[PDB]
Amino acid sequence: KLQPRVQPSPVSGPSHLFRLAGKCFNLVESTYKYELCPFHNVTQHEQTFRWNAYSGILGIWQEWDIENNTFSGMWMREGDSCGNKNRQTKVLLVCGKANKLSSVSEPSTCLYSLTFETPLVCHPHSLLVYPTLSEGLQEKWNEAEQALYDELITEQGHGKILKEIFREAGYLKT
Amino acid sequence: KLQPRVQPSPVSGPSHLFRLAGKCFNLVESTYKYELCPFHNVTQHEQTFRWNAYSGILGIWQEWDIENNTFSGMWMREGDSCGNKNRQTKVLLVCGKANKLSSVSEPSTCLYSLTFETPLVCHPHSLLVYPTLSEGLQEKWNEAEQALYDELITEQGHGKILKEIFREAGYLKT
Ligand SMILES: *[C@@H]1O[C@H](CO)[C@@H](O[C@@H]2O[C@H](CO)[C@@H](O[C@@H]3O[C@H](CO[C@H]4O[C@H](CO[C@H]5O[C@H](CO)[C@@H](O)[C@H](O)[C@@H]5O[C@H]5O[C@H](CO)[C@@H](O)[C@H](O)[C@@H]5O)[C@@H](O)[C@H](O[C@H]5O[C@H](CO)[C@@H](O)[C@H](O)[C@@H]5O)[C@@H]4O)[C@@H](O)[C@H](O[C@H]4O[C@H](CO)[C@@H](O)[C@H](O)[C@@H]4O[C@H]4O[C@H](CO)[C@@H](O)[C@H](O)[C@@H]4O)[C@@H]3O)[C@H](O)[C@H]2NC(C)=O)[C@H](O)[C@H]1NC(C)=O
Ligand SMILES: *[C@@H]1O[C@H](CO)[C@@H](O[C@@H]2O[C@H](CO)[C@@H](O[C@@H]3O[C@H](CO[C@H]4O[C@H](CO)[C@@H](O)[C@H](O[C@H]5O[C@H](CO)[C@@H](O)[C@H](O)[C@@H]5O)[C@@H]4O)[C@@H](O)[C@H](O[C@H]4O[C@H](CO)[C@@H](O)[C@H](O)[C@@H]4O)[C@@H]3O)[C@H](O)[C@H]2NC(C)=O)[C@H](O)[C@H]1NC(C)=O
Ligand SMILES: [Cl-]
Ligand SMILES: [Cl-]
Ligand SMILES: [Cl-]
Ligand SMILES: [Cl-]
Ligand SMILES: [Cl-]
Ligand SMILES: [Cl-]
Ligand SMILES: [Cl-]
Ligand SMILES: [Cl-]
Ligand SMILES: [Cl-]
Ligand SMILES: [Cl-]
Numbered sequence: 001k002l003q004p005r006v007q008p009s010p011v012s013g014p015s016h017l018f019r020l021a022g023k024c025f026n027l028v029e030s031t032y033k034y035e036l037c038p039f040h041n042v043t044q045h046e047q048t049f050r051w052n053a054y055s056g057i058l059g060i061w062q063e064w065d066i067e068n069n070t071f072s073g074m075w076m077r078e079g080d081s082c083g084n085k086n087r088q089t090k091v092l093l094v095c096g097k098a099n100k101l102s103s104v105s106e107p108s109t110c111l112y113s114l115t116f117e118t119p120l121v122c123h124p125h126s127l128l129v130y131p132t133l134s135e136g137l138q139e140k141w142n143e144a145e146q147a148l149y150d151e152l153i154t155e156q157g158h159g160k161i162l163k164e165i166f167r168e169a170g171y172l173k174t
Numbered sequence: 175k176l177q178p179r180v181q182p183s184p185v186s187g188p189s190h191l192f193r194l195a196g197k198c199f200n201l202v203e204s205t206y207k208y209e210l211c212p213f214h215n216v217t218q219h220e221q222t223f224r225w226n227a228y229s230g231i232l233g234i235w236q237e238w239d240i241e242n243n244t245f246s247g248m249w250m251r252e253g254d255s256c257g258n259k260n261r262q263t264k265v266l267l268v269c270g271k272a273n274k275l276s277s278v279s280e281p282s283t284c285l286y287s288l289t290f291e292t293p294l295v296c297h298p299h300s301l302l303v304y305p306t307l308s309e310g311l312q313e314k315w316n317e318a319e320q321a322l323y324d325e326l327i328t329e330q331g332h333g334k335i336l337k338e339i340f341r342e343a344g345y346l347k348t
Contacts, residue, residue, distance in 0.1 A: 015309075016309055016312055069299075095319070095320060095323065096320075097320055097324070119316045119317065119320050120316060121316075122316045122317075122319040122320045122323070123243075123304055123312070123315055123316055123319050124243065125243060125299070125302050125304045125305070126304065126316070128299055128302070130297065130299040130300075131299065131302060131304075131305035135190075138297070138300075141297065142293075142296060142297050142300075145296065145297055146293075146296055
């Protein structure tokens with residue numbers, strides 16, 4: 001039984017993925033056992049069966065990772081602390097036959113890359129961020145793409161506008 | 175007085191395009207004058223303005239042309255008869271500054287390609303067909319893309335499943 005440091009951000013993004021909120025899937029490795037509760041938290045429970053066996057929170061749903069006009073991954077931040085820093089996790093969404101937690105890795109100590117298989121992402125346009133936006137924020141994007149094509153703004157100024165949109169929608173915390 | 179052979183199919187597809195229904199735009203060439211009434215009909219009028227001047231129906235809104243997971247064009251069929259066949263028209267939607275009927279051509283006799291400029295299509299992801307589908311038809315599509323990657327169905331069998339999806343949504347006549 002663990003205490004989270006902050007609460008998860010609101011469920012946001014593609015509508016058809018919202019059904020995953022409140023569900024939890026787990027993967028049992030030899031050393032640890034991980035659980036992913038999408039839009040909420042990630043946790044591991046060391047299965048060495050010694051008395052001080054570790055159980056910690058790796059991250060709390062905070063913001064999205066948007067790269068190349070798509071949802072790159074889900075950012076889980078502000079977990080238990082390793083020392084000077086709090087644990088983080090980037091969940092990656094991959095086409096799979098069924099909702100399954102497939103792998104876990106540790107690129108840097110206390111930073112994790114979690115791969116989540118689900119069939120809801122098998123279509124290429126499922127993780128595009130443009131269809132998820134409100135009718136008004138699409139206009140702001142439409143005007144920015146045309147303005148960039150008309151050479152009224154720079155690729156740099158265009159990049160700024162997109163982050164303004166994503167922040168308003170709540171995909172990036174700010 | 176012109177009589178359409180059938181009635182135009184229901185308005186279907188992206189929501190932001192529905193506003194064009196009941197509107198009509200025209201292009202005046204030297205020989206003929208064309209009108210496009212989106213989601214309805216297409217017509218040409220020889221402009222000699224004599225009593226026997228030609229007036230014909232080129233097509234009646236029937237179904238979409240979906241290619242590459244997007245809306246390729248609008249299919250207009252069952253126009254006036256040329257002999258063994260009824261006239262057809264494929265309307266193509268292009269990014270333009272304003273709602274404008276831009277061009278008309280006749281690649282093969284009694285088949286026409288009509289180019290309609292509109293600003294509602296200027297964003298690349300505006301005409302994606304996946305977001306317009308019901309949550310269930312999205313599921314049906316995801317499972318079909320997954321089955322194809324697992325080599326349980328053929329690229330040919332995949333195409334048939336998609337036409338079942340598009341037909342169920344109402345984008346294709348049946
Ligand atoms: C391809 O697709 C195209 C797109 O869909 C399609 O085009 C559309 O076609 C449809 C079908 O034809 C059109 O819909 C109809 O439009 C008619 C035209 O309306 C306009 O003209 C009317 C003027 O009629 C007269 O009366 C006025 C006052 O009474 C006079 O001021 C006028 O000068 C005019 O007088 C003439 O007629 C008199 C007697 O008729 C005669 O004495 C006089 O001397 C002179 O000859 C206006 O009422 C009308 O105005 C309204 O709409 C405009 C829109 O801009 C507004 O600006 C106005 O403020 C106003 O709101 C237009 O100027 C309509 O008449 C017709 O209406 C009737 O039918 C519907 C359903 O059937 C009824 O619900 C409705 O109440 C009307 O009913 C009348 O007739 C029935 C019997 O017919 C009767 O029982 C009932 O009581 C009533 O009298 C309908 O809306 C549509 O407009 C087209 N749109 C476009 C963009 O083109 C095209 O056809 C397709 N082609 C093919 C080949 O498929
Ligand atoms: C990480 O994130 C995950 C998910 O985001 C968290 O997991 C969830 O934690 C909550 C607690 O905050 C759990 O809810 C409680 O559940 C208990 C027990 O019920 C459950 O287990 C039963 C086992 O058979 C099952 O029958 C229950 O089924 C019912 O409930 C579910 C949904 O709640 C519903 O879908 C079913 O149809 C049934 O209706 C259920 O699975 C329950 O008793 C609690 O309810 C009451 O009591 C508490 C305290 O008295 C009160 O506060 C409540 O408001 C309510 O009145 C409570 O709902 C939830 O089950 C967990 N889900 C999973 C998958 O584990 C996890 O806590 C987070 N951890 C950290 C560290 O952040
Ligand atoms: Cl969506
Ligand atoms: Cl929800
Ligand atoms: Cl892209
Ligand atoms: Cl520690
Ligand atoms: Cl603009
Ligand atoms: Cl936020
Ligand atoms: Cl006319
Ligand atoms: Cl054909
Ligand atoms: Cl394979
Ligand atoms: Cl393919």
